[PDB]
Ligand SMILES: *[C@@H]1O[C@H](CO)[C@@H](O)[C@H](O)[C@H]1NC(C)=O
Ligand SMILES: *[C@@H]1O[C@H](CO)[C@@H](O)[C@H](O)[C@H]1NC(C)=O
Ligand SMILES: *[C@@H]1O[C@H](CO)[C@@H](O)[C@H](O)[C@H]1NC(C)=O
């Protein structure tokens with residue numbers, strides 16, 4: 016079947032099947048201009064047994080790019096423009112069409128916390144303030160909600176959307192944690208008013224949780240309180256991400272990070288999604304234990320490594336970083352085929 020993704024118990028129900036899922040991050044899939052490259056990539060993800068793909072739902076600019084380059088929104092103090100042409104949201108339309116064809120579901124965030132592909136900084140350039148006042152900047156929020164409406168209305172009745180996601184890794188450095196609680200409450204309510212078929216999630220990294228060991232990611236320096244956020248009624252499941260190399264922790268500390276977050280989701284009566292993770296050094300050795308911990312911990316509904324790498328019919332490779340797991344590689348065998356085999 017092909018139905019809307021729902022929650023049954025503290026598990027996800029994907030096309031009528033209730034149970035744990037594995038997926039992957041492919042931010043760059045949304046910006047491919049050759050349709051054939053979307054299809055080859057999705058064919059590989061599908062044949063590997065993954066069910067869910069996370070793709071960027073944004074591409075924000077202040078200056079229009081060179082003619083032919085992709086852009087989804089131009090942010091200006093004198094009138095913003097949402098691009099629904101061929102070099103705009105039509106690229107994301109084909110992504111959703113290809114997900115429908117390949118029996119894949121998509122997680123789509125609407126804005127980046129970070130300045131890659133514009134982010135909150137692109138709104139600050141147009142609307143003033145700074146990265147922490149963005150959440151309550153009326154002009155910036157009015158345009159952000161216009162952009163949310165533009166994306167959600169295209170795909171509200173598609174069965175290929177796993178969930179709408181308020182942003183990629185929202186933070187409010189040094190802020191009261193209530194700033195993101197109130198913003199996330201209001202914006203998730205808005206998304207539910209536009210679409211009653213789909214699940215909604217925050218997209219945060221999971222920072223701020225008091226049941227940990229006191230390392231910086233468990234403190235409240237980034238404006239987020241995990242337990243407070245996952246109790247928001249209009250958020251259906253929790254997300255958390257994991258990067259020991261960026262956070263100054265060791266890799267094995269990641270097991271406790273999964274366990275504490277899973278317990279907080281289950282206490283709020285909802286599944287958790289282990290939505291990003293990576294190790295720069297020895298990824299097969301260091302990430303395999305995390306995949307096993309997630310699969311065997313109550314409260315966890317699925318996991319999505321960062322990130323898929325692939326190559327195209329013309330011989331070009333995809334965008335990549337030090338965490339990329341290239342399709343058909345030895346690390347694809349260790350972290351993709353062996354993991355999918357262990358799930359089922
Ligand atoms: C951001 O703007 C707010 C309001 O003016 C201010 O209180 C805060 O210090 C600013 N952040 C930085 C990093 O300057
Ligand atoms: C689309 O989904 C909305 C709920 O989000 C529902 O009200 C509407 O009837 C659906 N449209 C069609 C044509 O079925
Ligand atoms: C992947 O590896 C298999 C061999 O296991 C091969 O048949 C197939 O062509 C490869 N896919 C690509 C895209 O190279």
Ligand SMILES: *[C@H]1O[C@H](CO)[C@@H](O)[C@H](O)[C@H]1NC(C)=O
Nearest residue numbers: 228230264265266267268269
């Ligand atoms: C790393 O971190 C934990 C504490 O965070 C410590 O108990 C453990 O021994 C360390 N593991 C390695 C392999 O460094």
